[PDB]
Design a protein around this nucleic acid. Structure first.
Ligand code: MG
Ligand code: MG
Ligand code: MG
Ligand code: MG
Ligand code: MG
Ligand code: MG
Ligand code: MG
Ligand code: MG
Ligand code: MG
Ligand code: MG
Ligand code: MG
Ligand code: MG
Ligand code: MG
Ligand code: MG
Ligand code: MG
Ligand code: MG
Ligand code: MG
Ligand code: MG
Ligand code: MG
Ligand code: MG
Ligand code: MG
Ligand code: MG
Ligand code: MG
Ligand code: MG
Ligand code: MG
Ligand code: MG
Ligand code: MG
Ligand code: MG
Ligand code: MG
Ligand code: MG
Ligand code: MG
Ligand code: MG
Ligand code: MG
Ligand code: MG
Ligand code: MG
Ligand code: MG
Ligand code: MG
Ligand code: MG
Ligand code: MG
Ligand code: MG
Ligand code: MG
Ligand code: MG
Ligand code: MG
Ligand code: MG
Ligand code: MG
Ligand code: MG
Ligand code: MG
Ligand code: MG
Ligand code: MG
Ligand code: MG
Ligand code: MG
Ligand code: MG
Ligand code: MG
Ligand code: MG
Ligand code: MG
Ligand code: MG
Ligand code: MG
Lengths: 46, 18, 56, 102, 110
RNA sequence: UCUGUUUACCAGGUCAGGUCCGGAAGGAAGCAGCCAAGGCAGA
RNA sequence: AACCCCGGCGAGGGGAGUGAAAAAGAACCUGAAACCGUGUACGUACAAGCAGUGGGAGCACGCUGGCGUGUGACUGCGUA
RNA sequence: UGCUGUGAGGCAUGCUGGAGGUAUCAGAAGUGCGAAUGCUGACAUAAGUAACGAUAAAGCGGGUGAAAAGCCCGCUCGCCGGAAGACCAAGGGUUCCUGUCCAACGUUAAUCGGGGCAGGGUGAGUCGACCCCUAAGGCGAGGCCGAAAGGCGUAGUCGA
């Protein structure tokens, strides 16, 4: 039936995109944790 | 004619480098 | 339903005792061409009982 | 500071060629050298039409560890070990036994 | 003199191939070749191939006359088996085994 | 006892082509094609 | 792993060759067990049960008429 | 495999293996496994059993080819037709088209493919995005507020 993931790009990027993280203290802490674990990509970007 | 050039040409030729 | 104990290779052998194929005994030899073939079936060349009934 | 070099005549200490003498073609980075008439291998070559390369078993020369070859003293007829001194202002090689320059 | 021909990692289970393998054991390779021709199985064509190869081996390498050959040892072993996945209902999944086998045929003039 | 038909090397003859020996003279093993022929089916 | 051979200009294999070794062949040191087989000996188609243990005939193979090895018909006891 | 010890064990030795092992007496322990619905991998079992995804449906001739019920060609048959057709947005990201290949993938074969490998392919003043303008909503110089982080909001500046 209608499942849980109905994808949208504009949605995806406003919610989790780079800039969206950088907006806030918490977000920059996420990006800190990721850079510390050494991910391939931090956020969802194209 | 055409088919003669086609056949013979890359026959002799193609035979040499391949 | 599903089995209670793992049946041994023994039983497994028994069950398969009947599963053997039967090799076809006779290969009929056609008169004209001489090739072997099945009873009542045409040859590889389309011969049957001495005719060539298929051209092929 | 490299002891064995191109075109030195050497003698082979170790392997199936032990005792044989020859001339160095080239050196490789891994500390391997390739010597004339030395360490022939029989290699199989799939014929290549682009290079007009026939097939067949080509005898080729396979690299030998440079620890295993000694610089051949022609004076003494013996294998030698090599050392370095400064003559003029230039860095030069010599034989340890007769202490003569190369 | 014994001669080998093998086919390794054939798709069929050992089990299925055994059925056919056990048809030709012991016959002289002519009669056996025909047994195989008119057997309707997949294994049949696999094993036919291997047997024919075996004949070629014997003659060309070891100089055996084809008439004399029998099939002395023919055995099918288990091969490396590959896992796959078939999805099943209500979400559970199934590790599938695609089986292979080693067909080994050995012929001899004696 | 005759007709068709087939039968790659491993029955036979001719043995093209090519190939071995020879400076040359020429031989030679023999693939292919042909002919018997191995047969058989029909008579 | 030249080259030859079977195969589909396959897969895979068999020779050949390299190598000390190719039961070192890239599905590659060593290669255990479960698990699956081919071959040989023995037993099994009137027989009831935690499958062994005690007794035990025969048969096969080794030995030098006896001693080992495999098998185990038949019976005592026997509910992991 | 043989021998030996009351026992965990030890010794010797045929094959395999192809470079490390270690007496004696001491020392230190990640020191001994069958259970934990134990943890990882491997292989069984049911079993060559159930199943092969809409009950719209196939048949023949020829082609290709090692091999054609399924591929291409032709011919009849049958199903959808307010769709099982045609065009977009979203979403995907090369799946498009050609040649070539058939191990794995495709619930069978596959010579075929949305599979593999190589090449090609997307041409805008006027179609969209960008851009101009704002909605809800967001961010927000100063400002008000708040232990700190921060919350609210003005001028603005974004947002189809
Ligand atoms: Mg129970
Ligand atoms: Mg059955
Ligand atoms: Mg689901
Ligand atoms: Mg190959
Ligand atoms: Mg050798
Ligand atoms: Mg292995
Ligand atoms: Mg080693
Ligand atoms: Mg190994
Ligand atoms: Mg093993
Ligand atoms: Mg084993
Ligand atoms: Mg009675
Ligand atoms: Mg009885
Ligand atoms: Mg009973
Ligand atoms: Mg006893
Ligand atoms: Mg005896
Ligand atoms: Mg005895
Ligand atoms: Mg005994
Ligand atoms: Mg008993
Ligand atoms: Mg008791
Ligand atoms: Mg009782
Ligand atoms: Mg060894
Ligand atoms: Mg050895
Ligand atoms: Mg030890
Ligand atoms: Mg101690
Ligand atoms: Mg422990
Ligand atoms: Mg354990
Ligand atoms: Mg316990
Ligand atoms: Mg369980
Ligand atoms: Mg593993
Ligand atoms: Mg299972
Ligand atoms: Mg099974
Ligand atoms: Mg059942
Ligand atoms: Mg049933
Ligand atoms: Mg079902
Ligand atoms: Mg069924
Ligand atoms: Mg279907
Ligand atoms: Mg057809
Ligand atoms: Mg057709
Ligand atoms: Mg169909
Ligand atoms: Mg059509
Ligand atoms: Mg309608
Ligand atoms: Mg949407
Ligand atoms: Mg798009
Ligand atoms: Mg792709
Ligand atoms: Mg396409
Ligand atoms: Mg294509
Ligand atoms: Mg398939
Ligand atoms: Mg099929
Ligand atoms: Mg196939
Ligand atoms: Mg594709
Ligand atoms: Mg416009
Ligand atoms: Mg506003
Ligand atoms: Mg401020
Ligand atoms: Mg605000
Ligand atoms: Mg704006
Ligand atoms: Mg925008
Ligand atoms: Mg718009």
């Amino acid at each position: 039936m209608k499942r849980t993931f109905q994808p949208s790009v504009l949605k995806r990027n406003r919610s989790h995109g780079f800039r969206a993280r950088m907006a806030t203290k918490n977000g920059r802490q996420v990006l800190a944790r990721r850079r510390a674990k050494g991910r391939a990509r931090l956020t969802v970007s194209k | 004619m055409k088919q003669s050039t086609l056949a013979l040409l890359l026959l002799l030729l193609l035979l040499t480098p391949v | 339903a599903v089995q209670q104990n793992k049946p041994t290779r023994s039983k497994r052998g028994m069950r398969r005792s009947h599963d053997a194929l039967t090799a076809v005994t006779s290969l009929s030899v056609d008169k004209t061409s001489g090739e072997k073939h099945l009873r009542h079936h045409i040859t590889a060349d389309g011969y049957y009982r001495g005719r060539k009934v298929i051209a092929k | 500071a490299a002891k064995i070099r191109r075109d030195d005549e050497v003698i082979v200490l170790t392997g199936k060629d032990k005792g044989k003498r020859g001339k160095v073609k080239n050196v490789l980075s891994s500390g391997k050298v390739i010597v004339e008439g030395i360490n022939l291998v029989k290699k199989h070559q799939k014929p290549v039409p682009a290079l007009n390369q026939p097939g067949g078993i080509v005898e080729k020369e396979a690299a030998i560890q440079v620890s295993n070859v000694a610089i051949f003293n022609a004076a003494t007829g013996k294998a030698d070990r090599v050392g370095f001194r400064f003559e003029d202002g230039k860095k030069v090689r010599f034989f340890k036994s007769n202490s003569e320059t190369i | 003199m014994e001669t080998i021909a093998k086919h390794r990692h054939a798709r069929s289970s050992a089990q299925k191939v055994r059925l056919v393998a056990d048809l030709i054991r012991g016959k002289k390779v002519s009669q056996a070749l025909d047994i195989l021709t008119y057997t309707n199985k997949k294994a049949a064509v696999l094993v036919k191939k291997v047997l024919e190869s075996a004949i070629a081996n014997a003659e060309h390498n070891d100089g055996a006359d084809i008439d004399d050959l029998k099939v002395t040892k023919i055995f099918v072993d288990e091969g490396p088996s590959m896992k796959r996945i078939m999805p099943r209902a209500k979400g559970r999944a199934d590790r599938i085994l695609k089986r292979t086998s080693h067909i080994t045929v050995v012929v001899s003039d004696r």
